[PDB]
Amino acid sequence: SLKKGPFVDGHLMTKIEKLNETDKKQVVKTWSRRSTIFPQFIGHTIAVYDGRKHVPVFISEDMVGHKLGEFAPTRTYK
Amino acid sequence: KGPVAKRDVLPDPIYNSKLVSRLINKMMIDGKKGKSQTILYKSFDIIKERTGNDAMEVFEQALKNIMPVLEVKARRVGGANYQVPVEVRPERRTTLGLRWLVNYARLRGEKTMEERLANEILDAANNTGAAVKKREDTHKMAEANKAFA
Amino acid sequence: QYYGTGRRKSSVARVRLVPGEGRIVVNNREISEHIPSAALIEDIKQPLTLTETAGTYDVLVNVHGGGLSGQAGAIRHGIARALLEADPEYRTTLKRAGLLTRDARMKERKKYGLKGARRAPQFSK
Amino acid sequence: AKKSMIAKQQRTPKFKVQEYTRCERCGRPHSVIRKFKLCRICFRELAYKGQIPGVKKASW
Amino acid sequence: RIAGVDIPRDKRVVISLTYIFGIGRTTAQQVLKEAGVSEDTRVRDLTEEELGKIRDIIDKLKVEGDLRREVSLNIKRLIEIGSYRGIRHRRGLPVRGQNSKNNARTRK
Amino acid sequence: IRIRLKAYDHRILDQSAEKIVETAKRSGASVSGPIPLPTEKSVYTILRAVHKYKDSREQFEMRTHKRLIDIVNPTPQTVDALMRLDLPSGVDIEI
RNA sequence: AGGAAGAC
RNA sequence: CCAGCAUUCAGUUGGGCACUCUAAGGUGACUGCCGGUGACAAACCGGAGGAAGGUGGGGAUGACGUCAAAUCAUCAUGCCCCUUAUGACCUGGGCUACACACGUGCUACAAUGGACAGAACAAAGGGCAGCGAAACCGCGAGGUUAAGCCAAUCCCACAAAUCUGUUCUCAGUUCGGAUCGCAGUCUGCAACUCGACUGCGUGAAGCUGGAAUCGCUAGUAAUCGCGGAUCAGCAUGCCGCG
């Protein structure tokens, strides 16, 4: 994803789009750290696999260019 | 073991001025030669008509005034690490004289290379020199501790 | 049209000297902007002056390979071969004067486990 | 467990970047030579045996 | 002087303009090439009209405090986003990813 | 027509060189001498040990070399004769 | 005939 | 290879191997001669055609054994658990964390320099699910259609240190380049955890380093580059070359 746009997991892309076009629903279960946050995903709740659990995160408006991955750091220090 | 030396000749045996031939074509190598030697030649010219005589004999007495006659080594005897003065072979004399010349010329620190090299050449030309004073330091240690033989 | 070969430090040169008026030229470019590093100037001026054959022969020099000082040594060996080819009557005088050594000083083969084929890396207890 | 990953080696993988190199005469990754597909151990043993006719002791 | 802060006096302009914040050597070269000052100029000798037009072109470029407040705004935006990299700036650890055990000594 | 041959064993390639020169000369094919072409080199470095002692290594040389011959005149019957002529299994002929 | 220097 | 020739900015070409060059057979250096020592022996020193005189330089070559040294990570009787699982499939993470201490290296602290401009000298390897020239676009890594090469032809291959001009004039500086934000290029399904590279801006510590300590004898140290290997991509690591 450097010149031709964000590269994502299209199955749950269309799943969350068919979610939000109808209603607001519960957290989105995902193992995938792969995805970039598209700008139309504002206000959703994502459960990201941290390696041991699925942490909940709310999506704010400021999710400009960075991917989904930084919401769940995989290391605990002190 | 045993020492051994080799033979090699750079210059011509006849019709060869030693210091002039050395000055034009000998023993400074590995780059930064050309501009440094031209500005070094005109440093020789500015000290040539800075002194009131020929400058080669004051360069050679500068070499004498940097040129050491004795130095002292350290030998292990007793519990004091005593010092023994020694008479010196002429190639070692030449190596020491040029070595102190170049390293104190690069070591004192000045504006740039040609004027500093001329600065310690003139500083060796007069007797009140820094590395000259180090040569007399080597003597005053040597004839301070030459009661050891 | 006497022809000589010279090799020094991974470089070769060939020399052709014929009777001229004493002209000296390498690669058909001249002394000023073709020849830096005045060790090359004493190279090109030493043997013709020590011999009495200076102003008689003109020399064209062709060059292949190598660097500057090794190239100068190749010039040395080429012109030494050219003179021993041309005028052998004082070739023995040139022999015990020297300059016919053709030194075998070439780059050392790098040894495995060493840095520069002499330098072990570093040591500690 | 080695022949599980040997089965990964002969089987085509899911994506083409996931494919890697194994020498497959002896059983290891990690310093396979590409143009022989032999690693150091089984290469030098079978080279002292004398196959791969280009190869001999090296000195210059 | 130019951006409200002083200038060195006895050096060339293509170097002296690099002293003020947020502008640099290559940028100063490319602005003074079209400015036409021949890249060797003391500030003791210049004209007021060329001073005014370099004043407005460095006025249009992002020089004085705006780069500072811009990078501050992005980094505080990263703090209330959180998202790991802001935690790295808050802790002082290196960010672009390195061996954090061996050197890590420009920071902290 | 130019014929190349490239292999490891310069002995048997040399007797192949005079054997092809002998066949072409007895056919009268406007013969040219075999020109020695420069070799190509590949030196590989192997860990001497199995698990340890990285400073212990060994080197293995691979050297392969080529030679070229040229026939000026066409002479197609003798050219087909030297096509149908048998060759050893190391001479590695290329047309 | 030319230094004091412990333990595993 | 362009010597000896005619030809053109591409000296490509028409013609030819004497040279470097690639390489088979060799020629060659072996104590082969003189003197002096050495009981006249073996050897040592100084001399001569010589490219090298006393194993010419280097590599490969590593005896009986020692350290119960290292490896059950290629293979293999010896026991242990399983075979409705310490054996299996995949997704994500970790091997790259970080108050610290150490080993090995790189880049410097500079005017025996930095920056910019011009003239340079060209070793050894790799190339067809490739090497990729010219030209165009691009403030850049790169993109475009793409001539040539299964290679002493084509590409990597534009070698830097080197040599002449201007500047800086001794400063945390025009040194030094690390961290940081913005915007990108390439590879790959995917560069956050965790790739490389570029344009910017930011500019840090550092002004040659105590106790101690390391390498180095006929291109050796030191510097300057250049390739190559694993590999889609990633060098300061390693191997090799000048």
Swiss-Prot record, chain A:
GO terms for cellular component: cytoplasm; small ribosomal subunit. GO terms for biological process: ribosomal small subunit assembly; translation. It comes from the Bacteria. Keywords: Ribonucleoprotein, Ribosomal protein, RNA-binding, rRNA-binding. GO terms for molecular function: rRNA binding; structural constituent of ribosome. Disulfide bonds: none annotated. Part of the 30S ribosomal subunit. Belongs to the universal ribosomal protein uS19 family. Protein S19 forms a complex with S13 that binds strongly to the 16S ribosomal RNA. This is Small ribosomal subunit protein uS19. It comes from Bacillus subtilis (strain 168).
Swiss-Prot record, chain B:
It comes from the Bacteria. One of the primary rRNA binding proteins, it binds directly to 16S rRNA where it nucleates assembly of the head domain of the 30S subunit. Is located at the subunit interface close to the decoding center, probably blocks exit of the E-site tRNA. Belongs to the universal ribosomal protein uS7 family. GO terms for cellular component: cytosolic small ribosomal subunit; ribosome. The keyword Magnesium does not apply. Part of the 30S ribosomal subunit. Contacts proteins S9 and S11. Interacts with VmlR. Keywords: Ribonucleoprotein, Ribosomal protein, RNA-binding, rRNA-binding, tRNA-binding. The keyword Ribosomal protein applies. GO terms for molecular function: mRNA binding; rRNA binding; structural constituent of ribosome; tRNA binding. GO terms for biological process: ribosomal small subunit assembly; translation. It comes from Bacillus subtilis (strain 168). CDD domains: uS7_Bacteria. This is Small ribosomal subunit protein uS7.
UniProtKB/Swiss-Prot annotation, chain D:
It comes from the Bacteria. Disruption phenotype: Cannot be disrupted; as the protein decreases in cells 70S ribosome formation decreases rapidly, with concomitant loss of uS2, uS3 and YugI (general stress protein 13) proteins from the 30S subunit. Gene3D superfamilies: 30s Ribosomal Protein S14, Chain N. SUPFAM superfamilies: Glucocorticoid receptor-like (DNA-binding domain). GO terms for biological process: translation. Keywords: Metal-binding, Ribonucleoprotein, Ribosomal protein, RNA-binding, rRNA-binding, Zinc. InterPro entries: Ribosomal_uS14, Ribosomal_uS14_bact, Ribosomal_uS14_CS, Ribosomal_uS14_sf. The keyword Protein transport does not apply. PANTHER family: 30S RIBOSOMAL PROTEIN S14, SMALL RIBOSOMAL SUBUNIT PROTEIN US14B. Belongs to the universal ribosomal protein uS14 family. Zinc-binding uS14 subfamily. Part of the 30S ribosomal subunit. Contacts proteins S3 and S10. Binds 16S rRNA, required for the assembly of 30S particles and may also be responsible for determining the conformation of the 16S rRNA at the A site. The major uS14 protein in the ribosome. Required for binding of uS2 and uS3 to the 30S subunit and for association of the 30S with the 50S subunit. This is Small ribosomal subunit protein uS14B. It comes from Bacillus subtilis (strain 168). The lineage of its organism: Bacteria, Bacillati, Bacillota, Bacilli, Bacillales. The gene is rpsN1.
From Swiss-Prot, chain E:
The keyword Zinc-finger does not apply. One of its GO terms (cellular component) is small ribosomal subunit. Gene3D superfamilies: 1.10.8.50, 30s ribosomal protein s13, domain 2. It comes from the Bacteria. GO terms for molecular function: rRNA binding; structural constituent of ribosome; tRNA binding. InterPro entries: Rbsml_uS13_C, Ribosomal_uS13, Ribosomal_uS13-like_H2TH, Ribosomal_uS13_bac-type, Ribosomal_uS13_CS. Pfam families: Ribosomal_S13 (PF00416). Residues 91-108 are annotated as: Disordered. GO terms for biological process: translation. HAMAP family: Ribosomal_uS13. NCBIfam families: uS13_bact. Part of the 30S ribosomal subunit. Forms a loose heterodimer with protein S19. Forms two bridges to the 50S subunit in the 70S ribosome. Belongs to the universal ribosomal protein uS13 family. This is Small ribosomal subunit protein uS13.
